[PDB]
Amino acid sequence: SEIFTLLVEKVWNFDDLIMAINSKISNTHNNNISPITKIKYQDEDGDFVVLGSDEDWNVAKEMLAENNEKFLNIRLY
């Protein structure tokens, strides 16, 4: 349910994206290790798709770059 909004600066190698997610989410010292590893991502604030292996993210980065879109949303459920 919880929605998160993030924009992929300098094309993250996923780890950068995860770390950025945690940087935003509870920067203090809560679940700032891994976002439940159930990260789900949305693009152009319109479509929702979920990743885990460094492959779906490859599709997303290419999508963002090719589409020109950069808005990304992250769902935890």
Rounded Cα distance between 35 and 5, Å, is 14
Owner of token pair 């935003």? 24
Count of the separate structural domains present in the chain = 1
CB-based contacts of 57: which residues, under 8 Å, 6+ apart?
Answer: 14, 17, 41, 51
Q: DSSP letters of 22-54?
A: HHHTTTTTSS-S-STT--EEEETTTEEEE--ST
State which residues form the domain around 6: 1-77
CB-based contacts of 11: which residues, under 8 Å, 6+ apart?
Answer: 61, 65
CATH number, domain containing residue 8? 3.10.20.90
CA distances, 30 to each of 22, 25, 27, 34 (Å): 9, 9, 7, 10
